[PDB]
Structure formats: C-alpha cells, structure tokens
C-alpha cells in the first residue's frame, strides 16, 4: 500500500506519555487540511515529515 506523508505542526505537551515517546499533531501533505494525532519514537520537532504506514488510527496515550 502507498504510505502517507504528514508534516508535524505541533509537538503536544503535558500529554503524560511514556519516556522516549512524544505525542504530536500532524497535518497531511496530500490533503493539506486534515490532521491526526500520532506517537513518535525519535527526536521530533515542528515542520518535519513523518511517513505513516496507516493514516486512519488515532493515537492514544501509551503510559
């Protein structure tokens, strides 16, 4: 299946995430208005692109 590319518009704070896991909000590059909340393992900042294998799942707190 094709993969989706989504740009990080904001690194969410005070999430309660597990250490090393960062919760972010990303806006789709294909449709530039749709947004989704995701979990990121690496060091992430704003305005970098994530490659999402699935575009439909909404992320939850990992704890």
């Amino acid at each position: 299946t094709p993969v989706t590319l989504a740009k990080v518009i904001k690194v969410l704070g005070r999430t309660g995430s597990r250490g090393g896991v960062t919760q972010v909000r990303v806006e789709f590059l294909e449709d530039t208005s749709r947004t989704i909340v995701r979990n990121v393992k690496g060091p992430v900042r704003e305005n970098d692109i994530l490659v999402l294998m699935e575009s439909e799942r909404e992320a939850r707190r990992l704890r």
Binding site: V3, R18, N39, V40, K41, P43, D48, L50, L62, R63
Partner: protein, 209 residues
C-alpha cells in the same frame, strides 16, 4: 551572442599545481571525483536530514555538531558515515583511516555499478531508514512512528554494523563489505543486513499496532 570575460590573461603560477587540482576550481567534488550535484534525496521526509547541498573536498570537517539538538542534521552525510565507521572500539579516533575506507568504498561502488557513489549512499540511507517502530509498555509492545532524524541515525548505524559483521572473520575487508552493503541497500535487494533489519522492525510494528 552574449559573453562575459573575467580572465584577461592565462594563469601560470610559479609553483606548479597539478592539473586535476586545476580543474578542481570549477566544481567542488568529493575526493576530487564525485559530484554533489545531480544528487537527489529520493525519499522526501528525509531531505532536511540527509543533506548533500554543500559540496566538500574531503570528509574531514571538524565542525561542532553536538552542541545543539538538531545540529547533526546539518552535518554532511559522508562525514556522518565516516564518524559511524570510527565506532566499534579498536579504531576509536582513527578518522583518517575511516576517511580512507570511505574513499576506497566509493571507488569500489563506482567501479561495480557505474553510478555516482554519493547517490548510492543517499539511496541506501533513505531505503534503510525504518518508517515504523515499537516501544515497550509497562510485556506489551506498542507501534509508534519514528522521527526523520532517528531514521537517518538508525540507517547509518545499521549499514556500518552490517559492514563490520560481514568483514569480521572473513577474507573480505571493511571497504569491500561496506560497498556491497551500500549497493544492495540502494537496490533494496533484501540481501543486505540493514534492509533485513528494517523489514523486521516494520513487520513487528505492523503486528503490534
């Protein structure tokens, strides 16, 4: 018919400078052979983190790249490959040795593939960067996405570790095994250790999503 003349006398220096050094002023090339232009990062989301925009002559830049969090993305990617080749203990600090290994590796890559070896390195890194990973939850594992910087870091680490493993206890040397690893990784041929590890991590992530 428009022409600009900026050289009004042919230049001859009293000290003799070799001719390949003399053509080196028209374009900056890696080891005076490989061109940083027509080099494209095929995978977007990695354009900012695999940087080839600024040409260099050799892969020994002494800049500070550890002072800031994302300063290491501004580092040239051949320099990062060399820095990851200084790993594994026995050759800690032997950067000239690692630069020599990269030079021979790029020669082998260009001889075998008839391509620009910088492009082969870029394609290898963009292919071997995993796109999804897992993390343990206190033993549940939950699938998460992975940042582009971690993708580049893990790609470089996987390529260098695979090269070391292939070179250990074998006739083949680190330069030959790294050239083979980069060629197979740019091809995506699944023979390479790094592509196998990337597929393994992505498969485990697909399971645990």
């Amino acid at each position: 018919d428009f022409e600009v003349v900026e050289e009004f006398t042919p230049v001859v220096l009293a000290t003799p400078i070799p001719e390949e050094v003399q053509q080196a002023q028209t374009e900056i090339k890696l080891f005076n052979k490989w061109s940083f232009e027509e080099v494209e990062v095929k995978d977007a989301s990695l354009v900012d983190y695999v940087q080839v925009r600024q040409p260099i002559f050799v892969a020994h830049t002494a800049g500070r790249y550890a002072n800031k969090r994302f300063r290491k993305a501004q580092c040239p990617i051949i320099e990062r490959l060399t820095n990851s080749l200084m790993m594994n203990g026995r050759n800690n600090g032997k950067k000239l040795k690692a630069v020599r290994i990269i030079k021979h590796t790029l020669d082998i890559i260009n001889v075998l593939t008839d391509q620009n070896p910088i492009q082969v390195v870029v394609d290898a890194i963009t292919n071997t960067g995993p796109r999804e990973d897992t993390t343990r939850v206190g033993a549940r594992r939950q699938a998460v996405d992975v940042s582009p910087l971690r993708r580049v870091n893990q790609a470089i680490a996987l390529l260098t570790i695979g090269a070391r493993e292939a070179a250990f206890r074998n006739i083949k040397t680190i330069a030959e095994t790294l050239a083979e690893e980069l060629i197979n990784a740019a091809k995506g041929s699944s023979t390479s250790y790094a592509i196998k590890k990337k597929d393994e991590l992505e498969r485990v992530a697909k399971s645990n999503r």
